[PDB]
Amino acid sequence: QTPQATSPLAAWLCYLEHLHSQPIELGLERVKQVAERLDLLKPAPKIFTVAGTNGKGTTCCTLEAILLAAGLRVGVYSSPHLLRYTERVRIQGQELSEAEHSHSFAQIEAGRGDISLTYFEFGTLSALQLFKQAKLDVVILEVGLGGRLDATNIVDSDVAAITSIALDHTDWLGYDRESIGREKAGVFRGGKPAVVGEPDMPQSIADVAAELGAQLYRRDVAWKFSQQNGWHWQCGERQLTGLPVPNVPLANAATALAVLHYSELPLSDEAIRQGLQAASLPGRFQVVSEQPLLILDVAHNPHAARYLVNRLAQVIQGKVRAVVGMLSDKDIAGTLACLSERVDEWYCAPLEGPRGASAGQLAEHLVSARQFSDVETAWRQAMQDADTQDVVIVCGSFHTVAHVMAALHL
Ligand SMILES: Nc1ncnc2c1ncn2[C@@H]1O[C@H](COP(=O)(O)OP(=O)(O)NP(=O)(O)O)[C@@H](O)[C@H]1O
Numbered sequence: 514q515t516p517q518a519t520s521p522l523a524a525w526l527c528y529l530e531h532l533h534s535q536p537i538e539l540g541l542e543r544v545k546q547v548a549e550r551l552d553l554l555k556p557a558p559k560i561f562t563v564a565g566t567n568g569k570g571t572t573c574c575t576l577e578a579i580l581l582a583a584g585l586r587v588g589v590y591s592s593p594h595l596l597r598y599t600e601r602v603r604i605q606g607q608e609l610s611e612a613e614h615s616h617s618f619a620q621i622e623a624g625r626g627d628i629s630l631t632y633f634e635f636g637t638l639s640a641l642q643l644f645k646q647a648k649l650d651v652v653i654l655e656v657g658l659g660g661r662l663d664a665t666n667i668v669d670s671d672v673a674a675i676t677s678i679a680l681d682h683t684d685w686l687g688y689d690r691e692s693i694g695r696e697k698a699g700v701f702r703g704g705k706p707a708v709v710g711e712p713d714m715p716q717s718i719a720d721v722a723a724e725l726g727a728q729l730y731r732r733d734v735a736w737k738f739s740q741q742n743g744w745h746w747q748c749g750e751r752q753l754t755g756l757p758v759p760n761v762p763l764a765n766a767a768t769a770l771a772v773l774h775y776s777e778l779p780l781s782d783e784a785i786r787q788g789l790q791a792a793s794l795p796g797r798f799q800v801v802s803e804q805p806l807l808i809l810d811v812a813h814n815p816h817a818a819r820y821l822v823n824r825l826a827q828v829i830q831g832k833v834r835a836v837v838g839m840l841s842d843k844d845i846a847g848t849l850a851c852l853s854e855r856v857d858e859w860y861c862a863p864l865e866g867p868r869g870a871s872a873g874q875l876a877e878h879l880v881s882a883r884q885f886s887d888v889e890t891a892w893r894q895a896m897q898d899a900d901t902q903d904v905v906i907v908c909g910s911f912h913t914v915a916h917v918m919a920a921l922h923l
C-alpha cells in the first residue's frame with residue numbers, strides 16, 4: 514500500500530526501495546516532467562552541481578561552510594547516507610525532521626500521477642521541494658551517479674564541478690577514465706563555468722565542454738593550490754594565501770574555492786577562513802579518538818585508498834591497524850593492495866546483505882589477517898590491541914564506518 518504525508522519516513526523508504534523500476538524508460542524525461550508539474554527546476558537563484566568519483570561530499574561541505582559563514586541561506590543535497598536518510602538534505606547546515614521528508618515525499622507522489630520514478634529520482638525531487646519552500650540563496654547538489662542522466666542534472670546549475678576521476682569498479686564495459694569523465698561532464702552548461710579539480714583530466718571532459726560551449730577551468734591550468742603554515746590557492750592573479758588547513762581533503766577545498774571564485778558571488782575574507790576552519794563531514798578522515806588515534810574514513814576504491822595512505826603517512830614507533838569491510842561490487846583487490854603499503858595489522862569483518870563481502874572474501878587477498886563476526890567486534894578488538902602511539906583506521910565502505918559511528922552512536 515501507498516504511504517501518506519503522515520506516515521513515518523521508514524514507510525516511505527520501505528516503499529521507495531520496493532519500486533519496480535527495472536523496466537521504466539532510461540533518461541531524464543520522466544523525472545523532468547514531474548519536476549515541471551511541481552515547479553521544482555529552480556530551487557534557489559544560485560545553484561552549484563558537484564560531480565566526481567571521490568570528493569563530492571567534502572567539496573559540497575566546504576562550499577556550504579563558507580557560504581553559511583557569509584550569512585547566506587544554503588541547502589545541500591547529498592548521498593549516500595551513513596545512518597539516517599535525513600542526512601541527505603541539510604538546510605542551514607542542519608538536517609530536517611522526518612516529518613518534513615514524509616510531507617515532501619507525499620507531494621511528490623501526488624504530483625507524479627502515473628509517471629514512474631526511481632528511488633533516487635523520487636528522493637531528488639523531494640530534496641528540490643524541501644529547498645524550494647525554504648527561501649534559500651544557494652543550493653548545492655551532489656550528483657548521485659555519473660551526471661548526465663543523474664536526477665540532479667534536470668536543474669540548470671550556475672557553476673558545475675568535477676572533483677576527481679578514478680575507477681570505482683571492476684568487471685566493466687567501456688569503463689575507462691575517458692568514459693567516466695564523459696558521463697560526469699554532462700552536468701556542464703553552455704555559457705557557464707565548468708570547474709575541473711582533477712589534475713589528470715581525460716580529454717572527453719574538454720570534448721564535452723567544447724561541444725556545449727561551457728567555460729572549462731581546470732586545476733593546474735586556470736587555478737592551483739599547494740600546502741605550506743596554512744596553504745595557498747591561486748586563480749590567475751587572484752591569490753588566497755596562508756589559508757587554514759581544513760578537515761577535508763585539500764584538493765576538494767581547492768575545487769570548492771574555484772567554484773566560489775567563478776560564481777562571482779561576493780564573499781569576504783572572514784567567511785572564507787571561517788568556512789574552511791568549520792568544514793568537515795563524518796566519516797571523512799574523521800579523528801574519533803587520540804592515544805590511540807582512531808580514524809573513520811569511507812574510502813572504497815583505490816584512488817581514495819591512495820589518498821588515505823598519503824594521509825596516514827603525515828600522522829605516522831607505532832602500528833597501523835585497519836578495520837575493514839567492503840562491498841563485492843568494488844575493486845577489493847586494488848583497494849586492499851593500495852592500503853597494504855601502510856597497514857601493519859588487518860582486522861577484516863563482514864558486511865550484511867547481498868552486495869556485502871565476507872570476512873574471508875576479504876582475507877583471501879591479504880598475506881595475513883584476522884577475521885571477525887561483525888564490524889563492531891573487529892573494531893573493539895583493534896582498540897583493545899592499540900598502544901597509545903598506534904593508529905586504528907576504520908575503512909572500506911560507508912557501512913563499515915556506519916557500524917562504528919552507530920556502535921559509538923556518534
Ligand atoms: N580528491 C580526492 N582524491 C582522492 N580521494 C578522495 C578525494 N576526495 C575524497 N577522497 C576520499 O574519498 C572518500 C569520500 O569522500 P567524499 O568527499 O565523501 O566523496 P564522495 O564523492 O561523496 N563519495 P561518497 O563518500 O561514497 O559519498 C574520502 O574519505 C577519502 O577517502
Ligand SMILES: [Mn+2]
Nearest residue numbers: 569570592593
Ligand atoms: Mn557522496
